[PDB]
Amino acid sequence: SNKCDVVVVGGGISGMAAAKLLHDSGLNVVVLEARDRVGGRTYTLRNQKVKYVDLGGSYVGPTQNRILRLAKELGLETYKVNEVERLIHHVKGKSYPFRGPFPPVWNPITYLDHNNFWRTMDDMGREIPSDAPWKAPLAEEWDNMTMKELLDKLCWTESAKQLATLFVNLCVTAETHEVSALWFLWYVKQCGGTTRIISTTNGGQERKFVGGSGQVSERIMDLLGDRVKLERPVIYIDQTRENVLVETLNHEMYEAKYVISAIPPTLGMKIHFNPPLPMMRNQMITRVPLGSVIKCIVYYKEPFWRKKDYCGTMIIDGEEAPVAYTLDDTKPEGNYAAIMGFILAHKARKLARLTKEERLKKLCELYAKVLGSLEALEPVHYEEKNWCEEQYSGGCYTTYFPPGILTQYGRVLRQPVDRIYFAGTETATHWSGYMEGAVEAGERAAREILHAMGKIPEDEIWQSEPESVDVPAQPITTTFLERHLPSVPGLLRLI
């Protein structure tokens, strides 16, 4: 057997961040990675046509201080996603350009309904503990409803319900009827609320890494050398003896003091456990699917949309459109002009039966309509990735919780099982679902082990992160009218 201090299962950002922290503390770590690459739900493809492209997780922004610090230490730089010109909201077959993060509305009833929807998402979130959403005062009530039920109650207009639906589909790559209202409300609040999660400027989509986010995992693999074992899917963990035994599919055995599980929760099902897992974890890992998305990048000769004072952001309502959301993916130098779009949730499943060339035609025709430009019909290149097909991800971006699961099983997610500690972005308390949450959870799991070893005190397990000097956060603000305008039923109670 190969003997080490800690085996880390998974070489995504979380497992690499955990392995780096333990290595830096002087422990002998091994990373066992199922794939022939590191990075997991991050994947940067390089070729002459694109230079580089993120086909998985890409964006970082203010308040994501851990991923920004880790990347800076590994030598990476960010650049800003283009948001100089106007965003577009495409509604009932017409483009409405706008500025500011929230698509505006002009009808006064629709205005009250939209304002109340976003305000209510944040009001509900203020009662949900980031580190324990099952402790929300209405946890059971909210966990026993889907987001479809909540939007049916809250939205008096079809306009608000359609945009709220798009919000859920885009944020969590899942239908409103698939997901728990408590879990969705927690998910938004633990990113800093509605404005922060939906924003490019001053929010989650502000920046990308120069050369791709895959460099985070690749550069930690560079540091660790042959401590990273590629094509070593873990099949078996045995905790019955003095040392933990970890077996891989290619017949290798690893012996360690402790294990970090840095894989999506449900992919724990791919490991046979001795002794069996405790009942609550045994069932939990069958109840926590990942969402569905195709990330598609269409390349053009120039960023032609900018000539029409459009930044390349499109928010596209309705069933017919394959893509509900796009961002400008042009490189910081103005070259490799491109539009990134997502095919979300049921559409990822519906449109997966098409060929790559058929998806490209649908996207170009959509973009030609929304940007009002024939130039959209002349792509020079195309790259896409359907994350639903990945055996060792299960989907993207993250794990969602169907109704009833977070209150019954949520407490299990980061509970250690003897000498197995749990990392992965699903176990974070701030930007869970993101690269930021991956770093938080991997470093916290590593520090749980250092505490178990008697190397650090209990109060050092959870550590605050200084604000980035390069990407400072501006405050989220609201107006008097936003805070105090009535809801639609509120306007009716006054009549």
Next chain:
Amino acid sequence: SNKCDVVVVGGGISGMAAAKLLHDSGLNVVVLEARDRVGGRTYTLRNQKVKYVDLGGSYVGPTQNRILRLAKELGLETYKVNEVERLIHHVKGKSYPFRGPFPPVWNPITYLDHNNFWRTMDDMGREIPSDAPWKAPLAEEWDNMTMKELLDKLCWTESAKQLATLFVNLCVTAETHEVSALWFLWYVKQCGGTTRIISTTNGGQERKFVGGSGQVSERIMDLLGDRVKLERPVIYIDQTRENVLVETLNHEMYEAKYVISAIPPTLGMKIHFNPPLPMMRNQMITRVPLGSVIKCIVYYKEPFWRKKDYCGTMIIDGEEAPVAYTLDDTKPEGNYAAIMGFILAHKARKLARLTKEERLKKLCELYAKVLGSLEALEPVHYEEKNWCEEQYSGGCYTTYFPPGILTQYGRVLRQPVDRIYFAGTETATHWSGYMEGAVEAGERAAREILHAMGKIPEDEIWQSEPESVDVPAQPITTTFLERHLPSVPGLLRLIGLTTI
């Protein structure tokens, strides 16, 4: 490698029925079973205090002709569960004895609401094809609602909503808010509807096997001999070469022409696939949990409840009650008197924290109150099994579908993946979730392979089953009033119109 025609993954009733059919057809089969025993979600415990007891699946009944036929061919016999005396419905801390399968209501408005609830479940079921529920005309609308939402729309009384809640909890070991309305309506219709699924006499809970249901899998293992490999959990299936390669945890390799996967769909996640599964199955097997249940059997000196004209059936509403449903589990000889009860859904999670002795105490106190009998506080023995702890089951009785999954992913549940065919009760079209459905699916998967091999024509893949001569099925009937009485909103519309 060990070479054969067909590797069957899983030695539950479904894999064992598949293996038996293939063996009987002259093929070389191997069964790879993870556990040190066959039977899976069936498990018959034998000891001197109980003689035998089913801690997993137990009951069979009219219309379950495949399991009856298989068991009969293996030399097994059935007996009837005791339903001679009155059933009890316990609600708001009082017991109401009754006869007939449905707990009755006297309040006229409540009666309309109850009648309409059961009628509507079956009316909706008649829109849903057993072999393709996603083809129901309103499949998307019904799949995008939980059963909680459906009961909130349908039940105009708390009485009906509370009974309907217990019905879902007991039938599918899940909460109403956990499960798709389309899936639940399918599940009930593919068992023959509300009356058949809830009934003891003339329904699913009519009979048990003398000596236990585990004998089905055990007697097939006896016929197959050393073809059944115990403690062989499958970890890897490789279809990249001319023969399929199947690898076990204990480092054995099996080579076959075809594979039958006879495990619960989500337990396919325990296998690494080369090439990877197609996208739809890859995601489906992360979306289909099994329910939660502890099956608990309390033994007594005598079946004392019969002396009070109670058969031992208790239908118990109330968050405080650990157990929502019981049956008499006395042996057919009248000895080893016992009450079987289920701890369902969230209660199986909440009460798993307790010791075995603490659960026995809570159950005895409950039974004493419901039966009005101090004798219930004098148990002589106790057996239980929490199925939520089983690595190689995932839960019991069966797999449930949360909202949105059956329409998006249901088409791939029994779609072959190259040379992998899918059995297991979850893939059945009649009594899916039951031992009957295990037999249907195992035999159908085996015939798909016989067809692939050119041994049988396509029209022999799906085969009807002659009715049991031992267990005749009475038809499900309704009265004129049951068919035509209005719902509560129907009555309100009649009132509004009159007064006009």
